[PDB]
Design a binder for this molecule. Structure first.
Ligand code: CA
Ligand code: CA
Ligand code: CA
Ligand code: CA
Ligand code: CA
Ligand code: CA
Ligand code: CA
Ligand code: CA
Ligand code: CA
Ligand code: CA
Ligand code: CA
Lengths: 219, 219, 189, 219, 189, 189
């Protein structure tokens, strides 16, 4: 790379992904139903000078489309969960966007980018970057220029989680939420322009295993 | 059979199916999602002397479990739909239960068993019968002693139907319902005892193809 | 590690009548009366195997249908009909006199062809071990707190019974449970 | 079975065994005399709504025919003891009959079916069932539809027991009885009809080894 | 099929050691230990798989005297009337009331410290294979001869040579492994 | 990737031993030990890889009485009300207040002297794989049920039979190996 052999860098006016059209794929693994799909989950708050954060609980019901399928199953577990960033602003946008993971709903969100950076899986990056890694979303490859976070799905506290709707989940105390949620992602930013600029969006690319069907009304 | 070679008939006190435990199976057929499953759909009104009828529209959203999966798809079509009867009363129960099919939500339900019998696919049978044909439900075989109706899925008026929830469907006029429903089943009975007796239940064994995913909130 | 195995009567089902009824049981070490007293002496436990068996006790002339299924969140609403129950994991529908020919399953390692039962998917619980808690203490908890002590719940519903309700049968548990960490019962339960 | 693959069940008006005529068989095993035979031991109390129990000590002298042969021997031991149920009522009889084993004559008999069910070898069953397992009595096969209890003959407290007549045994205290008796069977019932109905009978199918002959007057 | 239970329990607080001799005896039955008793009530028969009687001191090293333990096998025997009589009996071990503090690990580990004070019962040489479960209260109401039917062994703990003002010497614990068979309702048992 | 931390720390000065019984309890959480707590605040989850609770005497051999330790696994349990109740509980070890001086090496070496007084926690039999880090102050403000979510085990230390004038018996130390994963800012944690 440039840090060993030297090189040169250039920058275009702007760059962005074009998402490949797809359909959620279903599969059976014995009595288990496996769903593989990608979903746009969040539009980030316009990046400005001051710091700001957004958080999302990583539960089966968070992605709206998957959420529906989950209502018919009692338990689930993430087989793989990759959080991907997609820029939507020009290379003239100053600032830094960062993401990280937490595992206790009683936690307080990172109050600054320094706090966020000390945390697990923290990745800091310019708001305009990430387009070169489009393949991470459209294919199963992992480009080195892609901006993403892989969740340590094998290091959760429980083996399976019970399905719960987002509204009901929201109404729980942090402690009761802990029983239905294995992890939460935080996305923060700062150092942006005086006139805030929408930086990018967040996608979830996942493979989930759902078990033990249940009447949706009961669940 | 007995009608050609003679024989003898006997009758037990009672007989009933024991349903095999199963899980709904998912499959992909290109961009299409195929669901194969069986569901208990209706407990029949206790059979008594006077005639009575119950009707169910044959839409993707009628079976509660399937209904949930259908919310995520714009269009669907029955690949196969077999309506099965399961008795729950002793052989001492007098009367006849009958089923038939109609194709216009503006139709008036059969007012008597004679009206019902003239209709397409009408099958008349004692309320206590049907147990000997348990395999029709638990396997893919079709016993001659099974009591069922196969829907002529290839002779519907349209190629695909749009998904619509049962509540919203119920609120439509018969004519607007016709655009979302290809067929309706009627189940009637009469000639039962003075003290009415719950005769049996109705199961749907189906294979459905769902196409064109959609956000559930939009659908 | 102490391993206990036995079967015992757990519940006399409500008389089967025209209208639908459901009875639910949390699958906990303290639910079976005989096992409960042994469980009170241990801090944690886990089902090694749990088989829920139905035993009929009604005349064969009894109309109606019975069903069982399993759920895994105490915060769930119990099935309001056999149509809802029937769509739930491991559901099995059978007549109230079913199983009269398979009683041996209760006291032998044989599984008679005609026996009516449900094997719990013990390997797919959310935790490795569950703490012992007495039945009455359990009842007083919120659904959320119950979830920490209970891995599964079984529902038994029926409908289509006769005008004069008839006791259909009973529910038995045949289990193999592993108990660890002795404890004084007063401290525990 | 039906619980895995589904199926159907039917019930006849009634069913009962027809016992094969036999003769008690004698054999020598060195200096030991071995007797193999089956005997009707008890007519059960008519099953009614309320609970009732009957108990029998499992001693060599309990079966009347064997009892005579035992008078000529000082010691004995059960090689095998199978307790079998034989129904004598129609399938319309409600209720449950249960059997179990105890090993201390100082024990109090089960006061209810719940108490009985917690006990060793407890088997609960409808009073009309058991006919399908007729072969367990007439042959050496063990049908799965047979209703029976096998005594754990290898887990008794002593290796041999002394022969004692039933009258003399009855006159002993529970503690002195313990020296001559290795086990006792309890048969209870409840949930029967308002008009009590004789449910069935109990047979003992055994193989016993008798040793050390003695003048009957001394014994 | 059988259940194996393992635990250790405090069984008896010894009477204060004084100049004169005293003896206490305990029947080695499954029902003697309070915690075990509850589990045992649920099984018809049992047999000690392993039984170690342990002494734990609770007095200062300034305490004089001798505490001694031994085993007998007939409830009709007379208890030892002196340390001499006790000392002639099987497994007799004599020691000062403060002995055993350097071997306390023996209580909750599989270690057997050479400084521990214990008696290992010859579990394989009892008169019969299994013993029927019986409550302590009922047991005490029996004649010595009827007690033998339920009790395979008894331990006697005597002492003397203590101070003018009696001093509580220590306690007796049972660390055991017992096998239980043939479940039964406790009320019947 | 994870970080493994090893050290031993003084955790609790025991309340002076007197005639009457007293109990103290400590939650076995990563945040309980003061030194470890600082490191733990920097990681989201943890799990004890090894945990040995050690007793160190600080009183003369002239001190009478008994100190005992045991383990429980539900914050909703009631603490042992007597040495009898305590002694029936898992890993219970009883000993005089001056015991353990010949085994002090256990504290700073990999040696396990047979004269040492300790409790080895069954670290592989906790209800779940990982536990989330939580401060002691916050932990104490939780209900017993919410505490269980963060605490896998608790140790109880009781005593009695001591002198008329209470004597500080000793201290409790934790010698541990803990694995920490998923870094996090302490303020968030
Ligand atoms: Ca970091
Ligand atoms: Ca749920
Ligand atoms: Ca027709
Ligand atoms: Ca629509
Ligand atoms: Ca507890
Ligand atoms: Ca039993
Ligand atoms: Ca004699
Ligand atoms: Ca000696
Ligand atoms: Ca007894
Ligand atoms: Ca203990
Ligand atoms: Ca935390």
């Amino acid at each position: 790379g440039v840090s060993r052999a030297g090189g040169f860098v250039t920058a275009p006016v702007i760059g962005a992904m074009v998402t490949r059209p797809t359909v959620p794929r279903f599969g059976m693994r014995g009595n288990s139903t496996v769903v593989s799909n990608s979903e746009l989950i969040l539009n980030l708050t316009p990046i400005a000078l001051a710091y700001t954060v957004q958080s999302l609980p990583l539960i089966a019901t968070q992605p709206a489309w998957l959420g529906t399928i989950a209502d018919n199953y009692s338990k689930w577990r993430w087989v793989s969960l990759r959080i991907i960033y997609s820029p939507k602003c020009p290379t003239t946008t100053s600032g830094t966007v960062a993401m990280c993971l937490s595992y206790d709903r009683n936690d307080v969100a990172p109050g600054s980018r320094v706090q966020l950076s000390q945390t697990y899986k923290a990745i800091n990056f310019p708001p305009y970057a990430g387009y070169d890694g489009a393949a991470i979303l459209n294919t199963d490859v992992t480009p080195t220029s892609a901006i993403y976070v892989d969740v340590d799905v094998t290091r959760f506290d429980k083996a399976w989680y019970s399905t719960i709707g987002t509204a009901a989940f929201a109404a729980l105390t942090a402690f009761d939420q802990n029983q239905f949620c294995p992890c939460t992602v935080h996305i923060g930013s700062d150092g942006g322009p005086a006139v805030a600029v929408p930086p990018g969006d967040i996608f979830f690319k996942y493979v989930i295993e759902l078990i033990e069907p249940i009447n949706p009304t009961m669940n």
